[PDB]
Amino acid sequence: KTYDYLFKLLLIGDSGVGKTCVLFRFSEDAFNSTFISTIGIDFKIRTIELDGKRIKLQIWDTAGQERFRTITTAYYRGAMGIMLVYDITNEKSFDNIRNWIRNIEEHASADVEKMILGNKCDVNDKRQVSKERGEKLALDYGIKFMETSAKANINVENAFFTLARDIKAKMDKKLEGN
C-alpha cells in the first residue's frame, strides 16, 4: 500500500489571512524565501499516518479566487474537512468567519468536520482580535479552535492532525455496518 485513504480538505477564509502560507508550511515546511507564487497551485498534498493507516491529505486553497460567498453546494462536494482561517491582525476577517460558517451549514454536508484557525499568532504588536474572542466564536458553533502562525511554525502541524483524526474517527464508526 502506498496510502490507504484520501481526505479532501478545504482552506477557507478571507484573502490575506495566510491560507497559502499555512498550506505551504504544513505541506512543504516552508515560508517565503525561495518564493513560488501560486499561479494555479489549487492544492497541495501531505501523507500522514494515523493508527497504522496512511492518509493522503489533499488540501485545497481556492477560496477567494472567485468565491466571495458566491458559493453553492458544488464547491463543498467531496470535502471531508474544512479549515476556516482568519487573521488576528485583522478583525474584519474575524467577523467574516460568521458568514463563511453559515455558507457552510447551508451548502456543505452536515458530517463535514470544521476547524477555526486564528493565524499570525506571532504578531502581537498589531493584534486586533483577542484569543478569548476566538475561542468564544468557536464555542458558539461547537467546532474546535486554535491560534497559529505559519511564519513561526506554531500549531500548524497539530491543527491538521486534529482535523484529520476527527475525520478518521467518524469515518471509522460509519464503517461498522452503516
Binding site: T2, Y3, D4, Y5, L6, F7, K8, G40, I41, D42, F43, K44, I45, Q58, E66, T70, T72, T73, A74, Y75, R77, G78, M80, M171
Partner: protein, 284 residues
C-alpha cells in the same frame, strides 16, 4: 457551414450580401407534415444561442454587458443585458426532463461549459434542422465532434491529456474488492474499457487529483433528446448519472486510491483500452 433550410440554397439570391444574415433570421422565424412526426421541446435551449446572436449584433464595447446569470433558485438562467432581465429559461426545460428530476448544482466553470454546449446544440438545430431529422446520433456527433466543445471539455476534465490521446492497453492490477468499489462509477458494473469515461484528472506540482464529470454535462453530450416523447427516458438517464455521481463522492476517500494506482500503471492516464478498443474517452 452551408445552410439549406427553407430552400435557402436558391432563396438567398434575392438578397444583397449586406442583408442575408437578417433575412436568414426572419427565415428561421418563418419555418420553426404533422401526422407521423414527433413534437419537440427546444424553446428554452434555443434561447441561449439566440442570446449570443443578439450579442453578436452589439458593438464590441457593449458586448460585455450581455451575460447569463443563474437566479437564486438555481433553477433558471437569466438572460441579462446590463441590469435588465430580457428573458429566462428553466433548466429542466432546457434539458427536456420531468419536473421531479433532480438537478445537482454546478460550479461556475461547469455552468459556463453547460451553456457553451447548449449554444452549439442550439446553432445546429437552428441553422441545420437536417441533422436531427436524419438521426439523434447525427446531431449529437456534430456537437461532441465540435472542435471548441471537445477542447473545452478536455481542458476542464483532463487538462494535460490531448483529445486524440492514444489508447493505453489494460493491465488488470485490481482485486475483486477494488472492482466492486469502482462499480458505482459505471452503473453498478466493472468493464475496463468504459469504467473511466466520466473521470477527469489534473496534476498540480506533479500530484494528481481525480474528479467526475457533472451529470448534466454527461447528459447533454451523450443522452440529450429534444423530443417531448423522450422526456421520461431523458429523466431516466439523468437519474442514473446522478446516482453514479453521488456514489463517487460518498466513497471518494476509497475510490481515488484505486484510481491513482490505475493512473500510475497506465502512463498517467485512464484512457484505457483492450485489444485496440476503448470507450474511456471523455467525448468524441
Amino acid at each position: 457551414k452551408a445552410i439549406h433550410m427553407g430552400g435557402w440554397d436558391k432563396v438567398q439570391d434575392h438578397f444583397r450580401a449586406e442583408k442575408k444574415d437578417h433575412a436568414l433570421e426572419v427565415l428561421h422565424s418563418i419555418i420553426h407534415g404533422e401526422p407521423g412526426e414527433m413534437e419537440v421541446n427546444v424553446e428554452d435551449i434555443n434561447k441561449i444561442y439566440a442570446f449570443k446572436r443578439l450579442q453578436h449584433l452589439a458593438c464590441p464595447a457593449h458586448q460585455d454587458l450581455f451575460t447569463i446569470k443563474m437566479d437564486a433558485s438555481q433553477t433558471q438562467f437569466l438572460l441579462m443585458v446590463g441590469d435588465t432581465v430580457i428573458s429566462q429559461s428553466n433548466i429542466k426545460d432546457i434539458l427536456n426532463i420531468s419536473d421531479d428530476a433532480v438537478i445537482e448544482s454546478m460550479s461556475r466553470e461547469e455552468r459556463q461549459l453547460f451553456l457553451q454546449i447548449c449554444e452549439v446544440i442550439g446553432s445546429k438545430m437552428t441553422w441545420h434542422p437536417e441533422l436531427l431529422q436524419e438521426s439523434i446520433s447525427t446531431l449529437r456527433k456534430e456537437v461532441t465532434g465540435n472542435a471548441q466543445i471537445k477542447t473545452a471539455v478536455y481542458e476542464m476534465m483532463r487538462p494535460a491529456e490531448a483529445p486524440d490521446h492514444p489508447l493505453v492497453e489494460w493491465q488488470d492490477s485490481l482485486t475483486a474488492d477494488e472492482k466492486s468499489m469502482l462499480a458505482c462509477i459505471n452503473a453498478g458494473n466493472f468493464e475496463p474499457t468504459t469504467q473511466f469515461c466520466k473521470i477527469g484528472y489534473q496534476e498540480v506540482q506533479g500530484e494528481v487529483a481525480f474528479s467526475m464529470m457533472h451529470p448534466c454535462i454527461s447528459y447533454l453530450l451523450h443522452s440529450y433528446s429534444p423530443f417531448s416523447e423522450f422526456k421520461p427516458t431523458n429523466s431516466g438517464f439523468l437519474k442514473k448519472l446522478n446516482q453514479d455521481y453521488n456514489d463517487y463522492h460518498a466513497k471518494k476517500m476509497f475510490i481515488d486510491v484505486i484510481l491513482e494506482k490505475l493512473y500510475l500503471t497506465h502512463e498517467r492516464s485512464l484512457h484505457i483500452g483492450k485489444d485496440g478498443c476503448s470507450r474511456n474517452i471523455l467525448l468524441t
